[PDB]
């Protein structure tokens, strides 16, 4: 059986992880949900605890610790280990009764648990792309020390690229490892995108778009943060960098492609020019499941893809003029160093400002552009400990700088 | 990263045809990047002059002409070529001697129709890697080849047919190594749940039933993109090619018929898709060009660099998929019925189609007469006990094949 832990179990990813796990278990008892971890959603967590009965429960907000223990106490025949915050998170990561950990925690915050899951040589099903954009080089170093740890991508596009690769070569290397794309004969990557809701707007129409126009979609809900990045397409920009680090693919070899039907989740072009792609309805259950079964696949009762029904699939190149955040991602990525870290931190700020109606669409990229321009490359620390505090320091600085540029009312 | 060349010894059967030309085309091109392919033998039927030109360029250790009438003429032309002493052979004999060479590893089978089955069975008998393009040898001898491959455990059949190359390319080779094509449980070991078999649809895809009745071989032989043999080109028009590929899929990957869906994709970019048990679908795509599937069958389990134009999805812009009308392409229905019936129906199916296809090509019968004649031959045939040992099974297959073609001819005569 596969002993899994779900970090950010109450979120979009966490819930979909639990859904797909619940269904597969009806066919055969393969997954054992050993630990659930969230920030402050104590009631929802309590509901999940009741169903799955994980040996471990962890709430990051220590101020709702008693409430949690008080609710859980109402579940008959159940004596789980209830922990709190960082220490609680680290306690779960070091347990020997846990093999894989799904990181469904959003934002920079997700980096901490990703880091500890790796330090404990676990298999990390990573959905939190911010961890790889702000600490890509750091995660690669960390993975070179804890050689049994692995980062299996959950982000649908990267899961797609991962699935397209021949596992006979994948097994001979590992995500984030040097020469990954060379060992897999990777020539180029077609990074597919839904295009977001503003994809067909003219410049004048984009100028006045709002966060209310961009948030709601109809296949499944996602966090507000990622929903907004999807709108500005900064999501795909962050995903370009994530692709670079995860598969050691050069930036001039990643092509963003807008595929509005979202059936083809991404394609991989090999050195002979043949192209392999992964496809299915826009659902996160597949990428999450594959991250937990790889290198194997298991039966599910998901609705089969009906191509005749879908009938049409379209492709076009995004306009960098309308979606300038994509260009900024490439530039920060190509500059390397801590620019990707600055890009992400300043976007967290610009993103939230837009969400809360504080700035307009183009102010988002402008703010981010200015922070990237202000930052000066720093010598990359030699050991992980210092490199970590450096990433944190630069992250905080980029955010204060973004806020500052904004505070001058731009 | 460098030119650490470890050459691949290859033989090209049917080197002067569509597959053979495309084969040498890609070998020639990849060798300009890093000399990795060494053609040890070429083998044609009657095209002695074109074979001559190929020998001059590739200088293969072996040369073979199947028709004895041009054997001497071949030995003549080759004389000119200086500093070249190849072993010129002829007929079946020359083909068996080539398959038995120890200097050859991979044999590309580009021989058309039923004839391709002979060299196919002999390549397997010599434990060679068979980059099989000839689908007929698989439809009419599927379970024979299966038994043959269980005896010659080192022999392997790598598919060159585009759709089937696509499916194969979508698999994890760490699972494929535990088995091999045309072996029971291939789909289970690879967790294959279902196959989407793509088709160009052919030239009659938008014609009405009344229009179809009067279409001709001339209208079917004008495929706007590249050159292929006349049989397959007609088979593509009636979509019997796809029906044959349905059975080919069943035998190559052990996929149930009710798990094979024929889909019409006119852009011909997505060459086929593989649905795994989790419902995830992986597909192989590129411009419709036989060079990739051919090249892949010779590089597997690896891939090598090429200078082929890169697929440009943006330019392509649109991809369409739709169910094929069984009313307009009844040949598809017949293929499924024969495959599902098992035993020797596929053999009867392929044989009667060969007759029906040729009759149409020479404007002797009409579009719906093809589907009708095959239907009659199939209903006329009755199961037969499957022979245990391969030699007798091979006879039985040759017997049923000849019986089927003869039957189809009778029906044509009683009608004319
Ligand atoms: N949703 C999607 O389809 C996709 C998401 N992703 C990525 O996956 C990540 C998560 O996304 P998503 O599920 O949408 O986000 P959500 O906002 O829906 O959920 C975030 C989850 O993380 C938890 N969390 C927040 N802070 C902490 C903390 N300090 N300690 C423990 N848990 C915490 C939340 O708990 P609480 O409920 O208590 O607040 C919540 O369960 C993001 O990095 C995103 O970019 C990538 C591809 C697709
Ligand atoms: N062409 C294509 O794009 C595709 C073809 N295929 C399959 O590949 C096979 C070949 O097709 P294609 O190339 O179109 O056919 P062609 O008619 O173009 O070529 C047939 C080749 O086989 C040779 N040949 C015929 N009989 C013999 C024999 N007895 N001994 C040695 N060689 C012989 C011919 O030699 P000669 O020139 O001397 O007559 C010729 O080189 C078919 O089974 C087809 O279904 C599958 C997918 C795509
Ligand atoms: C589903 C997923 O992996 N995402 O990263 C959400 C991103 C957006 C998305 C939305 C719907 N389907 C696919 C992707 P986009 O950034 O617009 O491509
Ligand atoms: C390219 C190939 O492998 N074929 O078998 C030719 C098949 C025909 C074809 C023609 C043109 N392009 C692709 C396929 P169709 O049967 O119409 O799909
Ligand atoms: Cl598998
Ligand atoms: Mn994504
Ligand atoms: Mn794969
Ligand atoms: Mn400066
Ligand atoms: Mn084909």
Give the DSSP letter string of B46-95: S-HHHHHHHHHHH--SEEEES-GGGHHHHHHHHHHSSS---EEEEHHHHH
> How many angstroms does the Cα of residue A247 sit away from the middle of ligand 1?
23
Breaks (C-N over 2.5 A) in chain A follow: none
Classify residue A203 as exposed, middle or buried by CB count within 10 Å of its CB (0-12, 13-18, 19+).
Answer: exposed
In the structure encoding, which two tokens stand for residue A33, read together? 């949900």
Method: X-ray
A202 and A75 part of one domain: no
Q: Are residue B168 and residue B46 in the same domain, yes or no?
A: no
In a 13 Å sphere around the CA of A386, the CA atoms on its Cβ side amount to 6
- Separation of alpha carbons B20 and B29, rounded Å: 14
B236-to-A42, B139, B200, B274 alpha-carbon distances in Å: 62, 16, 8, 22
**Is the distance from CB of A52 to CB of A18 less than 8 angstroms?**
yes
* B156: its two tokens: 């392997």
Residues 6+ apart with CB under 8 A from B269: B285, B286, B287, B288, B311, B316, B319
Co-location of A151 and A164 in the same domain: no
Residue A306 phi, psi dihedral angles, 5° rounding: -110, 90
Using a CB–CB cutoff of 8 Å, tell me whether A162 touches chain B: no
How far is residue A396 from each of residues A342, A344, B166, measured CA to CA in Å?
A: 9, 11, 49
**A282 Cα–ligand 9 center, Å:** 30
What CATH number is given to the structural domain containing A19?
3.40.50.720
**B4 touching A (Cβ < 8 Å):** no
B244 lies in the same domain as B114: no
User: Helix, strand, or coil here: A337?
Assistant: coil
Residues B18 and B138 grouped into a single domain? yes
C-beta of A279 in contact with ligand 3 (< 6 A): no
How many Cβ atoms are within 10 Å of A146's Cβ, its own excluded?
Answer: 14
Boundary residue ending a domain (A275, A291, A319): A319
**What total number of domains does chain A contain?**
3
Residue A267 parent element (H or E): strand A264-270
Q: What is the CATH number of the domain that holds B365?
A: 1.10.1740.10
Indicate the residue of A267, A297, A310 with minimum beta-carbon distance to B277. A297
Q: Round to the nearest angstrom and report the end-to-end CA distance of chain A.
A: 55
Structure tokens that stand for A198 in this block:
């503003």
Answer whether B280 sits within 8 Å of A286, measured CB to CB.
yes
Q: Are residues A86 and A222 in the same domain?
A: no
Cα(A240) to ligand 3 centroid in Å equals 13
> Is the domain of B7 the same as that of B153?
yes
Domain co-membership, A315 together with A332: no
Written as six digits, the tokens of A84 are 């709190």
Number of continuous H segments (helices) and E segments (strands) in chain B: 20, 12
Residue spans of alpha helices (H) in A60-172: 65-72, 85-93, 110-119, 129-145, 156-164, 167-170
Closest C-alpha among A85, A38, A87, A109 to residue A395:
A109
A156 lines ligand 3 (CB under 6 A): yes
How many degrees, rounded to 5, is the angle at CA A305 between CA B291 and CA A153?
Answer: 80
Q: Which residue has the tokens 């069975």?
A: B121
Q: Tell which phi-psi region holds residue A269, choosing left (phi > 0), alpha (psi between -120 and 50) or beta.
A: beta
User: Which pairing describes strands A123-126 and A312-314: parallel, antiparallel, or unpaired?
Assistant: unpaired
Residues on chain B touching A171 (C-beta within 8 angstroms) = 174
Asked if B291 and B365 sit in the same domain, the reply is no
Please tell me the distance from the alpha carbon of residue B112 to that of residue A57, in angstroms, as a whole number.
66
Structure tokens at B406: 């003869």
β-pair partners for B274: B195, B282
Q: With beta carbons less than 8 A apart as the criterion, state whether B272 and B249 touch.
A: no
B43 SS3 class:
strand
Residues B308 and B199 occupy one common structural domain: yes
For residues B266 and B320, is the Cβ–Cβ distance under 8 A?
yes
If we measure between CA atoms, which residue out of A335, A333, A341 comes closest to residue A387?
Answer: A341
CB contact under 8 A, B321 and A302: no
B63-66 long-range contacts, CB within 8 A, separation 24+: B63/B87, B63/B88, B63/B89, B64/B88, B64/B89, B64/B90, B64/B91, B64/B94, B64/B95, B64/B98, B65/B89, B65/B90, B65/B91, B65/B94, B66/B90, B66/B91, B66/B92, B66/B94, B66/B95
Is there a binding annotation on residue A27? no
Is A10 annotated to bind ligand? yes
Torsion of CA B89, B91, B96, B99, to 10 degrees: 70
Pick from A86, A78, A141: which is nearest to A113 by CA? A86
Contact list in B for residue A190 (CB cut-off 8 A) is: 313
Lay out the sheet containing A2-7: strands in order across.
A81-84, A56-59, A31-38, A2-7, A100-103, A123-126, A150-153
The domain boundary residue, chosen from A299, A319, A339? A319
Residue A304 near residue A223, CB atoms below 8 Å: no
**What residue has token string 């949690």?**
A68
- Give the number of other CB atoms < 10 A from CB of residue B210: 7
A118 preceded by a cis bond (ω within 30 of 0): no
Answer yes or no: are the C-beta atoms of B343 and B141 closer than 8 Å. no
Which one of B325, B348, B370 terminates a domain? B325
Ligand nearest the Cα of residue A378 is: 8
Distance CA B311, CA A270 (A): 11
Q: Which residues of B touch A186 (CB under 8 A)?
A: none
Q: Which of B132, B173, B125 is nearest to B153 (CA)?
A: B125
Q: Which residue, among B164, B142, B141, B139, has the nearest Cα to B350 in the 3D structure?
A: B139
Q: Are B335 and B240 spatial neighbours (Cβ–Cβ below 8 Å)?
A: yes
* Resolution (Å) of this entry: 2.3
Place of tokens 């059967």: B13
To 5 degrees, how large is the angle CA A231–CA A237–CA A241? 150
Helix (H) or strand (E) holding A269, with range, is: strand A264-270
Q: Contact at 8 Å (CB) between A109 and A348?
A: no
Domain membership of residue A148 as a residue range = 1-155
d(CA B270, CA B281) in angstroms, rounded, equals 12
The reply to whether A224 and A116 lie within a common domain is no
Q: Do B174 and A164 touch (CB under 8 A)?
A: no
Q: B45 pairs with which residues across the strands?
A: none
What DSSP element (H or E) covers A309? helix A307-310
The whole-angstrom separation of Cα A76 and Cα A69 is: 13
| Same domain for B311 and B183 | yes
Contact B304/B162 with Cβ under 8 angstroms? no
Ligand 1 pocket: which of A105, A151, A220, A228 to mutate (most atoms within 8 A of CB): A105
Q: How far apart are CA B250 and CA B66, in angstroms?
A: 31
**Would you say A214 and A180 are in contact if contact means Cβ atoms under 8 Å apart?**
no
Q: What is the distance between the alpha carbons of residues B290 and B19, in angstroms, rounded to a whole number?
A: 8
In what helix (H) or strand (E) does residue A15 lie, and over which residues does it extend?
Answer: helix A12-27
A312 chain-B contacts, CB cut-off 8 A: 318-321
């Amino acid at each position: 059986p596969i002993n899994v832990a779900i970090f950010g179990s109450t979120g979009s990813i966490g819930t979909n992880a639990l859904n797909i796990i619940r269904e597969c278990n009806k066919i055969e008892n393969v997954f054992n949900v050993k630990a659930l971890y969230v920030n402050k959603s104590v009631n929802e967590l309590y509901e999940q605890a009741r169903e799955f009965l994980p040996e471990y429960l962890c709430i990051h907000d220590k101020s709702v610790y008693e409430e949690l223990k008080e609710l859980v106490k109402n579940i008959k025949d159940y004596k789980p280990i209830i922990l709190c915050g960082d220490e609680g998170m680290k306690e779960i990561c070091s347990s020997n009764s846990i093999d894989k950990i799904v990181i469904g925690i959003d934002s920079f915050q997700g980096l901490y648990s990703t880091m500890y899951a790796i330090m404990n040589n676990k298999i990390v099903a990573l959905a939190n792309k911010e961890s790889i954009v702000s600490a890509g080089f750091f995660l690669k170093k960390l993975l070179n020390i804890h050689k049994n740890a692995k980062i299996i991508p959950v982000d649908s596009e990267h899961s797609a690229i991962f699935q397209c690769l021949d596992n006979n070569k994948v097994i001979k290397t590992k995500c984030l490892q040097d020469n990954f794309s060379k060992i897999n004969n990777i020539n180029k990557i077609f990074l597919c995108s839904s295009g977001g809701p503003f994809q067909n707007l003219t410049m004048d129409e984009l100028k006045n778009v709002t966060s209310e126009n961009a948030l709601k979609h109809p296949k499944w809900k996602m966090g507000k943060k990622i929903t907004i990045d999807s709108a500005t397409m900064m999501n795909k920009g962050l995903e370009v960098i994530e692709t670079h680090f995860l598969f050691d693919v050069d930036y001039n070899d990643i092509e963003v492609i807008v595929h509005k039907e979202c059936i083809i989740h991404s394609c991989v072009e090999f050195i002979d020019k043949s192209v392999i792609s992964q496809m299915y309805y826009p659902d996160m259950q597949i990428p999450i499941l594959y991250s937990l079964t790889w290198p194997d696949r298991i039966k599910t009762n998901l609705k089969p893809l009906d191509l005749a029904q879908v009938s049409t699939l379209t492709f076009h190149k995004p306009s960098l003029e309308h979606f300038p955040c994509i260009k900024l991602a490439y530039q920060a990525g190509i500059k390397g160093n801590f620019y990707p870290t600055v890009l992400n931190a300043s976007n967290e700020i610009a993103n939230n400002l837009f969400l809360n109606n504080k700035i307009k669409y183009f102010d988002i990229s402008s703010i981010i552009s200015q922070v990237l321009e202000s930052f000066n490359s720093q010598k990359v620390s030699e050991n992980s400990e210092d490199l970590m505090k450096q990433i944190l320091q630069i992250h905080s600085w980029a955010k204060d700088k973004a806020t500052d540029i904004y505070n001058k009312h731009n």
